[PDB]
Amino acid sequence: MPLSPILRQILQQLFRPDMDVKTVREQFEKSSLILVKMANEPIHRVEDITIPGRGGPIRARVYRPRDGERLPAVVYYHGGGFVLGSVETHDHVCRRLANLSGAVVVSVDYRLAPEHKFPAAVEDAYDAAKWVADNYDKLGVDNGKIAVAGDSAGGNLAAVTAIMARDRGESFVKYQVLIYPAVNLTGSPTVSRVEYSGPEYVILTADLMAWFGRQYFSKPQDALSPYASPIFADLSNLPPALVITAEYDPLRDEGELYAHLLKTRGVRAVAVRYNGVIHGFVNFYPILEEGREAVSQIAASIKSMAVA
Amino acid sequence: PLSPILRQILQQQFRPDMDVKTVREQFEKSSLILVKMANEPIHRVEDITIPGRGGPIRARVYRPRDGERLPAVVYYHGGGFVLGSVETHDHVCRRLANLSGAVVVSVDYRLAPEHKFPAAVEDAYDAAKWVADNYDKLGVDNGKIAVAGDSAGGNLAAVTAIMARDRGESFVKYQVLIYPAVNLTGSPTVSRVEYSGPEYVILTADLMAWFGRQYFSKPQDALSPYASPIFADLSNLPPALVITAEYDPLRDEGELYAHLLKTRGVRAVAVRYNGVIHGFVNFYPILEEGREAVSQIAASIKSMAVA
Amino acid sequence: PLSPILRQILQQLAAMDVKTVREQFEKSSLILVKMANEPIHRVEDITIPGRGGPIRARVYRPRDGERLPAVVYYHGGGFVLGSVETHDHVCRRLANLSGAVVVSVDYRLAPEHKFPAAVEDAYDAAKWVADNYDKLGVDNGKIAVAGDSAGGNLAAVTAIMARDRGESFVKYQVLIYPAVNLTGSPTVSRVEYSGPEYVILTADLMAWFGRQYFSKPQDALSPYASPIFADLSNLPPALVITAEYDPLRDEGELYAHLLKTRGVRAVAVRYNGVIHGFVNFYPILEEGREAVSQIAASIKSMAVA
Amino acid sequence: PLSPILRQILQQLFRPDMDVKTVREQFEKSSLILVKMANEPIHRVEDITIPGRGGPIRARVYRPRDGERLPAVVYYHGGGFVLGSVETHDHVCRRLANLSGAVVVSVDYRLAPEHKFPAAVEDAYDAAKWVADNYDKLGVDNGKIAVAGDSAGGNLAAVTAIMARDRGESFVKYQVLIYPAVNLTGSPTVSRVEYSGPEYVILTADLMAWFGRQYFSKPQDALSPYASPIFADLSNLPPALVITAEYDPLRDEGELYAHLLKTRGVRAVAVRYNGVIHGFVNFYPILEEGREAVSQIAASIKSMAVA
């Protein structure tokens, strides 16, 4: 299927491996905020909290779409290659998710690389989800059940959080939504990785992916950890999964294989491919119909635990 | 790959010399097994008679809650233009109604070969138009009507939007096409040949050719845009959600239809469900993909996400 | 992903009545012909009496001998463009590598001669070669048909016509990214690779060719226009070459498959990283050289049979 | 779709706890059926002993015609680095020799588990270098040597080209990789999972995992570029022809390898054979795809068409 015409038009606008992390971070915030502002999403209540993690205080933003106790809970991890982003760059997606799902969304401001190498973000991701499950009365959410959700690098963090919970014999993760996740962080190529990582696709080029990996990892061998590459994990007894992939996305192949691999272990799991679009398309919902459709789908899937 | 549960299911005889009544009986019986295992509730449900140009059209109205000015979905069941009824898709409609908050009106359009094309197309338009016109008796909002259908009914849904468009009418605000047949000529796509071998069971080459013979008076009739909406003018059509399945003969054409809508300025989204075959939505009591699809469909209609 | 050198070849390609488009196709093709600079032992032009009048054909003979194998070749060009001259290099190289006499047919071009003018010429020339083997020094029982793109269509249709008459002079068919469905019925590849970025065969160019070829668009429904709708039984064994980034890729590969369903031995090979028309670029494109080498050797040994 | 006859061939039917010798016997026996039905002629053939670093290596020399300074092909049989011999691919080597005009030297490299990685790799390079060094004894042209191999043998061919390059040697002018394994880690591609279920028989998920356990001392060794050449520096390698199969687990990595070669300025062609599975070349007596492949490969070597 071809690129959606509008996306084709949006892509015609003009990164380097030598740029410093700070500059790239600032541009990614600036660019992200354009989308947030055009979304202009409402939210009934929102506040930032500090969650005590292993590596220090973790900032989280709590989006509450309505009044009431024992509300459903989503722990959300923003994308950005493990290097970029924050709760600010995905704020609109979280608000809309909250409002459509009726769930309290807790978006976790995990530690970024290269300052905090793998597994810093993984630790924060687990610590924050566990904190939400354990401190439900402070938040007015369900006792010790959450859905985990995230996009791209955040989809990795969602999958691995589920895995870490399973490895610790914890049962608080009830549902997982992986939005075009990176599940193999080794340098091993898939057809989609090579096919859609050319400069022409902009958002996730080969050069950028290589750069993210150099920031994320302290040593090559860490890419082989199942907490880095969850596609190498034992996938039994993981919670039901929705995996969203994009057609013209380097991570498409591995995303679709993860869903299948989940099923081979008897986990209920659905993979859906959005045609016509690139990696990261959910954040463009104000101007891409596919983004709106995905947020609708993700919300309703969480609300009813449709895959379970 | 095919979902593991689906591989087990697909393990196990249609003939092109079967008489329509037999195929109809077996289709209803199989379908009803799925309806029973779903065991869906509904607040209110009534069967009505819509007076169509070609005669009386039975429809089933599923009301999931109380209130006037509820949104509505006109639903067209699949079955090759030859099989099925409101009964065969009753679970899907109740579940759609419940999740969407919308009144679902499922249409028992006339079947081929007794009523060849364009009988069912004309009934599909009449039924949808009747729902619009009689919004008050239904307690539905005439400004919030969607059309939806699976397979052949996905065709009838798409064509109904076209028919309304051609008459300058605006009562279809949204269309959800669940693995629709949009090119009824024998022109192949890669998917049409790839997933139509006997081992896929549900929509085989033999089965497709047989539907075609039942539906049309002459094979050339498939060249009509009311038969093959992929050949229609597609401008000024309502926003569309197209659901496709990975292992589906109709996959390519449905994804192509979504794309062609976009090229005419119509907002449209194609989503492919991996590891599943044509017809998988009706299998939702046992396929997670099915449940996810109904969830997706209902929410997309409820919020008109694609618009 | 596209071959990098083919990226650079397309970036340098951007950088209309039929006459002008014809002349530009001729001029740029000749660049490739000259850079190939292929030798040939003997070459001369003949005049084949066809139903529609005389048909120019070029005979490439690679060696001395009577009873040589024969290939009737039909050039591409969307039924509107091209000539024996635009594909001279490909034909010379095919003959040298195969050892076969190649008879390239200068079939009548649209819009001057609408469908089925070229179909009629393609059949008449293939038959003439079969009938006139002695004056050619060829074996009338070792004739293959071959052609690229529109010429691929002509070769498939010529084989169908012979079949319809119960004639057996066509023993092998090599369809080089053929167009087998000329209707507006879409395939995924037709839409996927027909954007401006691919240059050689864009949607606009395909539509333009269709308007030139057909007197009315519904003529595409004829099985002599769209051989994918023909009965495919008892046709000669086939080699079908497709290109990965080609609108016609799906239908080419569908055609090979449907031959198999009817009991015809048939092989479909897809060349990765390349676009429609890649064979003619062989002097600067490794896929092109490989394809000519494969086609020539397949013909020589009738490997698929 | 699968070629209909291949669908038949497959339908006429390994377990991960079988011992190496039983699987070797069964592989040899079944291979020899195909060798017998080809019944290829050869002008001259004899077995020689090549002194490798790790000991004596049997090679079979197929000479298709008279003359000194004939071109040469060093050929490595497939079999997962565990099965096979010069015997199992004898027909393919004879036919390749006759069609190419080249002397073919099929190398009986050491098999795992007895001789783990990098035993076969060292034998492969040593045999090829020996051919280049002893060109006068074989009557070949030391400036027209190609490497070739199928599956595991395609890996060995690829890696031999890399080893020659790493030593500043230039005796490998051409490489033909027939559905090679170029990534021996457990990292998946779409094709690896898609076509590795039991219904494909020839190269299943269980068989692939079993081969990886035999070949490697420790699992990390697969990260070596001499085991997984797709991770190697690919600059300054010889021109490549890569043959893939549509319904093959190794399809994706094979196509990726040809492209990676291109990114480093090496001339390379990847061609996908449709309708067929891994190993299809050895089936040429009964598969048109097999005969076409042998024709293609031999002609490409003869003229060094990709160069």
Side-chain angles (χ1 to χ4, degrees):
Chain A
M1 166 100 86
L3 269 177
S4 189
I6 188 53
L7 192 47
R8 203 174 178 284
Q9 175 163 70
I10 288 165
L11 280 172
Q12 290 183 316
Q13 301 187 10
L14 51 148
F15 173 85
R16 289 189 320 288
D18 77 313
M19 280 186 181
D20 70 314
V21 184
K22 187 176 179 286
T23 299
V24 181
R25 267 169 193 157
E26 286 168 341
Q27 198 72 254
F28 184 91
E29 291 283 324
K30 194 210 265 192
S31 298
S32 296
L33 294 186
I34 289 156
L35 301 175
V36 171
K37 284 178 224 201
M38 54 193 299
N40 188 23
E41 295 297 352
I43 199 64
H44 176 56
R45 290 274 186 282
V46 60
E47 66 205 320
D48 297 343
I49 60 171
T50 302
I51 294 167
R54 276 169 260 194
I58 305 162
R59 185 265 214 88
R61 180 159 292 165
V62 183
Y63 305 82
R64 161 169 283 272
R66 66 208 169 100
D67 290 311
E69 298 183 76
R70 299 301 186 255
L71 292 200
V74 183
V75 180
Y76 188 89
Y77 310 102
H78 69 90
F82 306 100
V83 177
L84 318 172
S86 76
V87 298
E88 303 295 0
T89 64
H90 288 63
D91 194 86
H92 61 325
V93 175
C94 288
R95 285 180 180 220
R96 191 168 181 102
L97 191 69
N99 294 331
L100 289 169
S101 66
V104 173
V105 174
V106 173
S107 181
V108 179
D109 228 345
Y110 60 84
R111 279 176 292 160
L112 301 171
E115 295 94 333
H116 307 100
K117 301 289 202 166
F118 168 85
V122 161
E123 291 168 353
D124 288 347
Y126 179 79
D127 289 345
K130 175 77 177 338
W131 187 91
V132 166
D134 293 345
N135 295 262
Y136 59 92
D137 279 331
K138 296 168 196 177
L139 299 175
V141 297
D142 275 330
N143 187 342
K145 37 205 165 301
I146 67 183
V148 291
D151 65 295
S152 188
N156 179 284
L157 291 177
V160 170
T161 298
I163 290 162
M164 270 193 56
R166 190 273 322 279
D167 299 342
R168 295 192 163 265
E170 295 278 348
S171 56
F172 64 85
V173 185
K174 300 306 208 261
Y175 207 76
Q176 70 187 303
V177 171
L178 307 180
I179 311 162
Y180 31 72
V183 298
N184 194 342
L185 313 190
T186 72
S188 171
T190 63
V191 164
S192 64
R193 256 172 189 260
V194 168
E195 197 66 26
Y196 305 118
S197 62
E200 66 271 23
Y201 289 99
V202 180
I203 194 169
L204 193 63
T205 61
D207 284 349
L208 203 56
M209 282 185 286
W211 186 79
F212 288 142
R214 290 192 298 268
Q215 307 319 312
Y216 194 47
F217 289 119
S218 82
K219 62 197 189 291
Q221 301 84 13
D222 289 346
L224 296 179
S225 169
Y227 302 143
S229 295
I231 206 164
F232 302 141
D234 184 328
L235 301 174
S236 54
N237 295 130
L238 291 176
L242 177 60
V243 181
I244 303 293
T245 65
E247 174 174 14
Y248 301 94
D249 181 350
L251 308 184
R252 190 186 80 198
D253 286 359
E254 66 195 74
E256 295 184 352
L257 291 167
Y258 195 71
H260 177 74
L261 289 179
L262 285 165
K263 304 170 166 292
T264 68
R265 309 314 310 284
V267 174
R268 285 178 185 180
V270 174
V272 179
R273 178 195 293 188
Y274 278 67
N275 287 335
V277 289
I278 54 178
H279 192 71
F281 73 92
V282 175
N283 281 49
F284 288 87
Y285 73 77
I287 46 184
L288 290 173
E289 58 267 39
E290 285 84 6
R292 296 195 287 288
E293 182 53 37
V295 182
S296 174
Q297 183 185 359
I298 291 164
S301 189
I302 290 158
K303 185 173 181 168
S304 67
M305 297 192 154
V307 174
Chain B
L2 274 173
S3 165
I5 183 66
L6 212 40
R7 286 163 171 269
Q8 208 266 32
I9 290 165
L10 284 173
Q11 293 169 6
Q12 205 225 299
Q13 200 183 354
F14 169 89
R15 249 198 155 196
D17 73 353
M18 270 177 173
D19 75 300
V20 173
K21 204 174 110 306
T22 296
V23 185
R24 272 174 193 153
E25 290 167 353
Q26 280 301 296
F27 185 74
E28 177 179 283
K29 187 171 283 186
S30 294
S31 294
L32 284 179
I33 297 173
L34 299 176
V35 171
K36 310 190 202 86
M37 64 192 287
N39 189 37
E40 298 293 353
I42 199 58
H43 178 55
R44 298 171 204 272
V45 65
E46 272 294 309
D47 284 358
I48 61 164
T49 291
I50 290 174
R53 290 164 290 160
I57 299 165
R58 176 226 214 157
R60 184 163 286 168
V61 184
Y62 307 87
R63 169 163 277 275
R65 60 201 175 97
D66 291 320
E68 287 150 303
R69 308 304 159 105
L70 297 195
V73 184
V74 188
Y75 189 91
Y76 307 99
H77 71 78
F81 308 102
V82 183
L83 320 172
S85 67
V86 298
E87 303 295 346
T88 57
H89 287 60
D90 193 81
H91 63 321
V92 178
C93 291
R94 295 187 172 215
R95 197 185 183 88
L96 191 56
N98 288 333
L99 291 169
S100 68
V103 169
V104 179
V105 181
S106 182
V107 175
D108 255 3
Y109 54 89
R110 281 171 297 170
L111 298 176
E114 296 92 334
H115 305 97
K116 303 251 178 197
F117 166 83
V121 163
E122 293 179 351
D123 298 343
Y125 168 83
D126 288 349
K129 177 57 157 58
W130 183 96
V131 165
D133 286 357
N134 294 274
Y135 74 97
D136 60 328
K137 304 178 177 58
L138 297 174
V140 300
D141 181 334
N142 62 40
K144 298 204 271 202
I145 297 166
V147 295
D150 63 289
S151 190
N155 171 287
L156 291 179
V159 169
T160 295
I162 292 171
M163 293 234 64
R165 190 280 313 287
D166 294 345
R167 300 183 189 210
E169 296 170 347
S170 282
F171 62 88
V172 188
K173 307 289 173 200
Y174 206 74
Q175 66 186 304
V176 177
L177 311 175
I178 312 172
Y179 32 76
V182 296
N183 189 343
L184 299 182
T185 75
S187 208
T189 59
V190 163
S191 71
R192 253 200 153 88
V193 160
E194 194 68 27
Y195 310 114
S196 65
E199 68 284 5
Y200 285 100
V201 179
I202 195 276
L203 193 76
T204 64
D206 287 332
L207 197 47
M208 282 184 282
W210 184 83
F211 289 143
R213 297 194 293 279
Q214 306 315 300
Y215 192 44
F216 296 116
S217 310
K218 298 282 163 261
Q220 283 158 336
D221 294 0
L223 293 171
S224 165
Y226 301 120
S228 295
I230 204 155
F231 303 136
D233 187 324
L234 304 171
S235 70
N236 281 328
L237 284 173
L241 176 61
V242 188
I243 305 295
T244 68
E246 184 168 16
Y247 296 92
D248 188 348
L250 306 194
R251 184 192 75 197
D252 290 358
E253 69 203 59
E255 297 183 356
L256 287 163
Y257 193 72
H259 177 75
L260 284 170
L261 286 161
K262 297 175 172 291
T263 70
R264 308 310 315 277
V266 180
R267 285 167 183 180
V269 172
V271 193
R272 178 189 297 181
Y273 279 66
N274 293 326
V276 292
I277 49 164
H278 195 71
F280 75 88
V281 178
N282 280 38
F283 280 90
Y284 75 76
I286 56 188
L287 283 187
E288 62 266 44
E289 284 81 3
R291 295 195 288 289
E292 185 52 42
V294 179
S295 168
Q296 171 173 23
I297 288 161
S300 182
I301 288 160
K302 183 184 178 166
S303 67
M304 282 184 193
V306 177
Chain C
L2 262 196
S3 179
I5 188 68
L6 197 60
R7 271 232 211 196
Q8 287 190 80
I9 277 175
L10 288 172
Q11 285 173 302
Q12 155 42 301
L13 254 199
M16 279 190 189
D17 48 27
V18 176
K19 174 163 183 291
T20 303
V21 185
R22 270 187 191 143
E23 284 176 342
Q24 288 288 34
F25 182 76
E26 212 87 28
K27 283 192 283 161
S28 54
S29 300
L30 284 188
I31 292 175
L32 293 171
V33 173
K34 293 194 216 177
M35 64 193 297
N37 199 34
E38 301 285 359
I40 193 68
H41 179 52
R42 301 263 182 280
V43 63
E44 62 176 288
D45 289 356
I46 62 178
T47 299
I48 291 174
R51 280 168 274 172
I55 304 159
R56 179 237 214 140
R58 183 163 291 178
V59 188
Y60 306 83
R61 156 172 287 272
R63 54 194 176 110
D64 299 320
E66 292 182 271
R67 304 296 189 266
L68 303 198
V71 182
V72 185
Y73 189 89
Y74 309 97
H75 72 78
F79 304 103
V80 177
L81 317 171
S83 62
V84 297
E85 308 292 357
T86 57
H87 288 61
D88 195 86
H89 64 320
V90 170
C91 292
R92 285 188 184 211
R93 200 174 175 93
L94 190 47
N96 292 334
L97 291 168
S98 68
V101 173
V102 181
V103 179
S104 185
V105 181
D106 224 21
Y107 58 86
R108 285 173 296 168
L109 296 180
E112 292 90 342
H113 302 105
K114 298 289 199 165
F115 170 86
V119 163
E120 288 173 359
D121 289 348
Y123 175 84
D124 289 347
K127 186 82 206 295
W128 186 100
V129 163
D131 287 353
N132 293 265
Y133 64 90
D134 212 70
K135 49 218 68 35
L136 292 179
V138 300
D139 184 337
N140 67 354
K142 267 193 287 144
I143 301 175
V145 295
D148 62 299
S149 190
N153 173 283
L154 295 183
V157 173
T158 297
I160 285 159
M161 290 187 62
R163 189 281 313 282
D164 285 337
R165 298 203 197 196
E167 263 149 7
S168 52
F169 63 88
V170 186
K171 299 299 193 320
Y172 207 73
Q173 51 187 322
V174 180
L175 317 179
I176 307 164
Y177 33 76
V180 300
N181 187 345
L182 312 182
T183 63
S185 220
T187 67
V188 165
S189 64
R190 273 213 168 198
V191 178
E192 192 76 10
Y193 311 112
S194 59
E197 66 277 16
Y198 291 114
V199 189
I200 178 148
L201 198 71
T202 68
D204 288 350
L205 196 51
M206 281 182 280
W208 186 80
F209 286 140
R211 288 197 298 278
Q212 306 313 307
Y213 192 37
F214 294 121
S215 179
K216 80 176 183 280
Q218 287 163 329
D219 284 337
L221 294 176
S222 167
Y224 305 91
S226 295
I228 201 163
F229 300 122
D231 181 348
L232 301 184
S233 62
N234 296 117
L235 293 172
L239 180 66
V240 182
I241 306 289
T242 62
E244 177 176 20
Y245 293 94
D246 182 351
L248 310 191
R249 181 187 91 198
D250 285 3
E251 65 193 71
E253 294 175 3
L254 289 167
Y255 197 79
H257 181 68
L258 291 167
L259 285 165
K260 294 184 173 296
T261 60
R262 306 314 312 282
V264 172
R265 277 169 188 180
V267 168
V269 177
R270 180 195 287 193
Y271 275 66
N272 284 345
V274 288
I275 60 197
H276 193 78
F278 74 87
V279 174
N280 284 42
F281 288 80
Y282 74 77
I284 64 190
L285 196 61
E286 58 269 43
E287 288 76 9
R289 293 192 290 284
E290 181 56 37
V292 174
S293 169
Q294 177 181 184
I295 287 158
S298 191
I299 286 169
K300 183 180 184 198
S301 70
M302 283 188 186
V304 170
Chain D
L2 276 176
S3 193
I5 196 65
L6 194 50
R7 192 157 160 171
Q8 260 201 346
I9 286 147
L10 292 170
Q11 278 176 293
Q12 305 157 57
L13 40 137
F14 161 91
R15 314 192 327 285
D17 58 342
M18 272 174 192
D19 83 287
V20 182
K21 217 161 88 304
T22 310
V23 187
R24 277 171 182 158
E25 293 166 354
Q26 198 61 222
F27 186 81
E28 208 97 355
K29 177 208 144 167
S30 284
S31 299
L32 289 178
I33 291 182
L34 293 172
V35 172
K36 175 156 180 254
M37 62 191 306
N39 185 33
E40 300 289 354
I42 195 68
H43 177 53
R44 285 186 214 275
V45 64
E46 69 185 277
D47 286 2
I48 65 169
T49 299
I50 299 183
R53 278 172 290 180
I57 303 150
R58 171 167 76 161
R60 187 161 282 174
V61 179
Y62 303 87
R63 164 165 279 272
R65 65 200 172 96
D66 288 321
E68 314 319 278
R69 308 309 186 273
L70 293 194
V73 182
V74 188
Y75 191 88
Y76 311 97
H77 69 93
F81 307 105
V82 178
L83 314 174
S85 62
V86 300
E87 302 294 5
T88 62
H89 286 65
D90 190 87
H91 66 321
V92 172
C93 290
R94 283 175 182 239
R95 194 182 183 91
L96 176 54
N98 295 330
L99 288 174
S100 71
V103 175
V104 167
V105 187
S106 180
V107 178
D108 235 341
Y109 55 89
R110 284 175 290 171
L111 299 170
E114 294 93 336
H115 311 277
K116 303 285 210 173
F117 169 83
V121 160
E122 288 174 344
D123 295 343
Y125 165 84
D126 287 340
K129 178 64 186 292
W130 187 94
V131 174
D133 284 354
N134 300 276
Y135 72 93
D136 63 324
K137 290 190 175 78
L138 299 166
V140 304
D141 181 330
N142 61 36
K144 307 191 295 264
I145 301 182
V147 293
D150 63 294
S151 192
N155 173 279
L156 292 172
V159 168
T160 295
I162 290 161
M163 276 178 71
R165 192 279 314 280
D166 289 352
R167 297 159 181 258
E169 279 160 348
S170 298
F171 63 88
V172 179
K173 306 299 188 194
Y174 208 73
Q175 52 180 322
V176 178
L177 311 183
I178 310 157
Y179 34 75
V182 297
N183 183 344
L184 308 185
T185 73
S187 206
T189 61
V190 163
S191 70
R192 274 197 173 233
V193 172
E194 199 74 51
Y195 312 116
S196 61
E199 75 274 18
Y200 288 98
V201 168
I202 197 282
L203 189 64
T204 67
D206 290 349
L207 196 53
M208 285 190 277
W210 188 80
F211 288 141
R213 288 197 289 285
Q214 310 309 319
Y215 193 47
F216 292 122
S217 307
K218 278 207 147 187
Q220 200 236 249
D221 301 346
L223 295 168
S224 169
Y226 296 127
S228 291
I230 200 165
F231 305 130
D233 186 304
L234 305 176
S235 69
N236 285 313
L237 284 170
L241 174 63
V242 183
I243 303 291
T244 63
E246 179 171 18
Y247 294 88
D248 180 344
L250 306 193
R251 183 187 79 195
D252 286 1
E253 69 200 66
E255 293 178 355
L256 285 163
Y257 196 72
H259 172 79
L260 291 163
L261 291 172
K262 289 175 175 299
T263 64
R264 305 309 314 285
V266 180
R267 280 167 185 186
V269 171
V271 179
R272 177 189 299 184
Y273 275 66
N274 276 359
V276 296
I277 60 177
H278 193 70
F280 74 88
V281 179
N282 287 38
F283 285 92
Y284 74 78
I286 54 171
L287 267 197
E288 59 267 47
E289 285 82 4
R291 296 194 292 285
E292 181 54 39
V294 182
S295 171
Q296 169 169 200
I297 291 161
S300 182
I301 290 165
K302 190 178 169 183
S303 71
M304 278 184 201
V306 173

